[model samples]
Target: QNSPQDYLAVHNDARAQVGVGPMSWDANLASRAQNYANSRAGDCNLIHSGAGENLAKGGGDFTGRAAVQLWVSERPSYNYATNQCVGGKKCRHYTQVVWRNSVRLGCGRARCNNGWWFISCNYDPVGNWIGQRPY
Candidate 1:
């Protein structure tokens, strides 16, 4: 249910809501993410790939749109006025998705051996720096 185009469309839609520029897909980044996903297929632990990244774990039927939705769902936690996450919720994934400087994206998804799903998306020109606003 998840294709590269599906991933791009969902991301662009989220960025559009915040007036951020669109992101293009990168084969190399996708490959790297895929490799990393493969490596985590056994443990499925949340880990960073040293790039602007987002991770998701879901049921066997999870789709890319659902994963992006999960990330965008954190929008409420991000306070633009203060440029930080509020109410003790996580907002880094939301911030990274709409990161104005990151113009390229690559995502990977794997069905873990445990029957769950592992998803990752890597961004180029990484974002989410401390004390910085995504847009």
Candidate 2:
């Protein structure tokens, strides 16, 4: 195993056709990951990078998602603490996780937010996002 650096090429498994998911064989981790990929493959987001107040590299591309990122300011706020999207609804949450791999992350929806948006990589022990959790 040379690690995921191989893009999961090391896995030679088959899918179990049953559920209503988008997979070639049906149910494989790699296929599942590709499901995540295909789900987002149709993204045409006009990402506004390096604008307003973000450190992302400035550029324009309609190939990915165009999302407005929400992050903690200079000082971390605990006023309305929310765990980063780690489960349930991580994909469609306002909170986010940084590029780095950390033990934990938190997001606060300030005062006007309807509820908390969060994510956590501790989803299933594989160190991936579990999606957002409930406030």
Candidate 3:
């Protein structure tokens, strides 16, 4: 179990590692994420919440830290110079987590009907734009 502050801590920690500014928590974003997470409970699908978003699903005991960990683990796939993901792998989540221009964060987690945990973190000013580096 994690509080909203827990989620914020994890995000700020990750951003700090890359020298990006810390992000403040946003209640409205959290509320929107929560609503979308609830709607995905039935399918556990990786759907976007119409914002800069990262989605994760894990077994029943998944923690908020675990979701952020999974996203940050994609760091190896990102190349700052090229401003793109390399090796045909995914890095959008990682990029969003460390996006320098983004300064707001809000996340939500829910236990799905299938006994899995659905997690989402919404970013402000969005990230991962074409021709731009995350940092």
Candidate 4:
């Protein structure tokens, strides 16, 4: 899942560590949320086990947990034009709407050239981008 994304850098200071890309905001966030929900939903450990107890039970995979949290919990924004989104003309906090919330691993996230990407974009300097329209 670490494949290179045609990503955009999250500019807000608090979320600098997490990067959002030019993919559909709905597809990005909802898919992630679904992946996360599914990852935990079927996993007995995740469903019954809450967060790990600090390495006591097999050295807790906090790194893994943090990875998941960061990976799947990233916020998504719309790039209507010049990065002006649906939420506001200048604000990036758009109300994200999702058509679906969960996808099993290996399930097609959507259709891609190689089936690895549901959405693709053209990336320029700074990890920002413009998306293919009518996707």
lDDT of 3 by residue, 7-109 (tens): 8777788777666789888888888887788888778888874447888999867887888888888876766556557875676688888877778788889
- For residues 1-135, could you state the per-residue lDDT of candidate 1 as single tens digits? 477888888888878876778998897888887778878878988786644888888987888678988888887786665655777667768888888788888888987878999888888677776545587
Question: Considering every candidate listed, which one attains the maximal lDDT?
Answer: 1
lDDT of 4 by residue, 31-106 (tens): 5533543443333132211211000011222222232223223234344343333453422112111101111111
Give lDDT tens digits, candidate 2, residues 1-135: 212222111111100111111111222433333333333333422121111111111133311112122222211321222433333332332222222222221111111122222111111111223442212
Query: What is the alpha-carbon lDDT for the whole of candidate 4?
Result: 0.24
Name the runs in model 4 displaced over 4 angstroms: 1-11, 16-26, 44-135
Using TM-score as the yardstick, the better of models 1 and 2 is: 1
Ranking by TM-score: 1, 3, 2, 4
Least lDDT summed over 10 consecutive residues: which range in candidate 4? 49-58
Model 2 per-residue lDDT at 44: 21
Q: Which parts of model 2 are misplaced by more than 4 Å?
A: 1-5, 8-27, 44-123, 126-135
What TM-score, computed on C-alpha atoms, does each candidate reach? 0.87, 0.20, 0.85, 0.17
Clashes of 1: 0
For TM-score, the strongest prediction is: 1
